[model samples]
Target chain A: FQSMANVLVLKSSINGETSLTNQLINEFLAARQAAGHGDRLIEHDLSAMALPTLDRPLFAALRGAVDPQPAIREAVALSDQLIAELKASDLLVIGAPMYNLNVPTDLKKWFDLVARARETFRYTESWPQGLVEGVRAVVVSSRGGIHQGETTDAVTPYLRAVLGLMGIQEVEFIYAEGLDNRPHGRDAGIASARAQIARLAVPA
Target chain B: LYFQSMANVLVLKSSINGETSLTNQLINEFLAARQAAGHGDRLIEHDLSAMALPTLDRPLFAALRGAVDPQPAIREAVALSDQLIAELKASDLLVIGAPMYNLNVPTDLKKWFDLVARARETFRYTESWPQGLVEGVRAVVVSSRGGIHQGETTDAVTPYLRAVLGLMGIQEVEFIYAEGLDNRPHGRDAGIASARAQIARLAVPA
Candidate 1:
């Protein structure tokens, strides 16, 4: 029945092998197994197979221009596939590490590929609605200090707002703040984030 | 006439790849129309795309918080934004051509917003909430949408645009959407027509 619950983890880390994202994914898989769902792990590591940025040719394609170049067509096809997969998935785990105080270019690229107009969402006279439904997103973001209230932490707020716009209201964020060079703070932040994750109820 | 003369324009175009863009077309047309109406000189264009704008990372924000002179990149970007704000101080027109990516505004645009939307710079933070800095700028957003409006199911492009612009105190933002350009059947003429109609109906100084 439903093949042990499909879990699509979007690993947004640039580091291929050793990354907090990999660690988190492993932990998440373990959590799922503990709760009796092990066979449905679907991982898409973007860093390992990064998507191209939406350059001029890609933008032109978005405007309905058919590219005669095989490379361009292949890139466009890949984008379409990413969007389709996003629509089909039930749960999305976004491993977001704040690069340059914003979303990583890779993750943003994936977002560009998936969040196409009329395909992923649309607007009405009353309000904007998100077409991608029945899926909850969990954003795992790691940041260098606790900038939640003291400063304008654009990362969390921006993510929350963007996801809300996508019609995913039920978003759970696991933030490991003060990590980078802050050795003492790193342990605390990871501990806090992991503790929070541990408390979440898994799907039956 | 009054509105045209007092328009505060914030142009957030990424003129990267060393190529002229659709954004340039919109900006040029907007300026030309205003000029023909004897209000061209009133326009202020902050060309971020051409400038070597810095990534809005920790170091830059820390410098801003401390009021320290930023690095070369940060200094340049901040100065550009400051100039934009100065021009916006007595403006009422904002015509922007925003290219969409992953259903959101470019990072450069967001950085511009962050720098320009400073407390005591473009806006003021208070007990209630942050008040918008530039009060009278009527924003005309020219966006390129790849898909059509499918009733009521889609991603978060429009709302995000509206909300973020609103947060910056730009309440009278009008959207000129050129949607469904990626889909089949509709030609380039259709997309151009939608943008052209909006531009024609736009209230100018003349």
Candidate 2:
């Protein structure tokens, strides 16, 4: 078995230091530390990170341009940097705080940059296939409302689909919902989420 | 009163495929049918693929949300946001050509929404809940997807566009799905044909 795992933690909450998802991430890291696993950690604070959207210049670069311009080179470089991180990770910890009924725009932009053709995925005549493998993801989703297993939750299904497309099939979602609820509901939600985290079997 | 019934239609085309996009073709048919039904075409088209909006980055966010000391570029971004809102405010019907990219709306389309959903402009927070200021504007979303995920939990584009558009005060949204374009057995022509029929049947107010 491996001695140590490389963990990639993505923090996307715009709430910055006071974010509930960040608090949950701290607890998750601490739990891993307490479990005697000295995992190598890589953190991406997406709120502060300005990943490029898949616009014209970026698309031209991604499509394999010939004699590319300066902007195109910069765009390609960013994509390569992002994909490199994804390739090196053994585990992914995504802090997805809900915004306007979906994941943050920055997080979405991160996915857009990472899901590159011929790099992350390929077409095999039959169907498109994901290249990424052997990576497990724990998505820490903190919401203002209790929308788990409900139609109102656009976050879970979208994340599942996108992550699945990246070949990261084994994903465990941790929800700290009802944060907008008064004193008791917020505390209970946090407590239940922590209990879930505690019950998680440590990485082998 | 008769001339007043003539509506301004603002069309937003977000497909990267330009002329070859199925959603773009569907929008053409929609406008054709709308005009034939005596609806005025005082049209404003935004080809998002050609002229993409800047992503809601930190500086843009600061500009829109109120920066203590805004720069010149920040002021320009804020002006763009204002112009987008003004376009929406002037339009009676908003037609969006939304193609599914990784099971959701395109990033450029989302960026447009981010710019327009300004506080004290498009929306305002009341004591109880936030209220949408945009009024009398209806939306028709031309959704083109590679897979048939309609009525399923995976159909995120519909619900998300519905919810966000509703939040921005466009509660009356009509979604036309053009699905199953990836698989040949599903018949790309048939999917386009079905969506065409839906567009033909869509009510166009004079």
Top-lDDT structure, candidate number: 2
Backbone atom clashes (below 3 Å) for every candidate: 19, 0
lDDT for position A134 in model 1: 79
lDDT at position B178, candidate 2 = 81
Over all chains combined, what TM-score does candidate 1 have? 0.57
Model 2: DockQ score: 0.36
Tens digit per residue, CA lDDT, model 1, A162-196: 66656777788777776643348778877877776
Runs of candidate 1 exceeding 4 Å displacement: A1-92, A95-137, A140-201, B1-10, B15-20, B35-38, B67-77, B148-155
lDDT of 2 by residue, A83-167 (tens): 8888888888899877777787888888888876787776654555777778899989887663211227778888887777767
Q: DockQ (Cα-based) per candidate? A: 0.12, 0.36
Residue range B1-206, candidate 2, lDDT tens digits: 75676788889999877767789989989999988887767889999777647766556766677665467766877888899899999999999999888777888788788788776788775544457789989999999877732211277788888877877778899988787776566568878888988887884554
Model 1, residue A89: what's the lDDT? 74
Candidate 1 residue B102 Cα shift, in angstroms, is 2.2
Between which residue pairs do clashes occur in model 2?
Answer: none
Native contact recovery (fnat) for each candidate is 0.07, 0.29
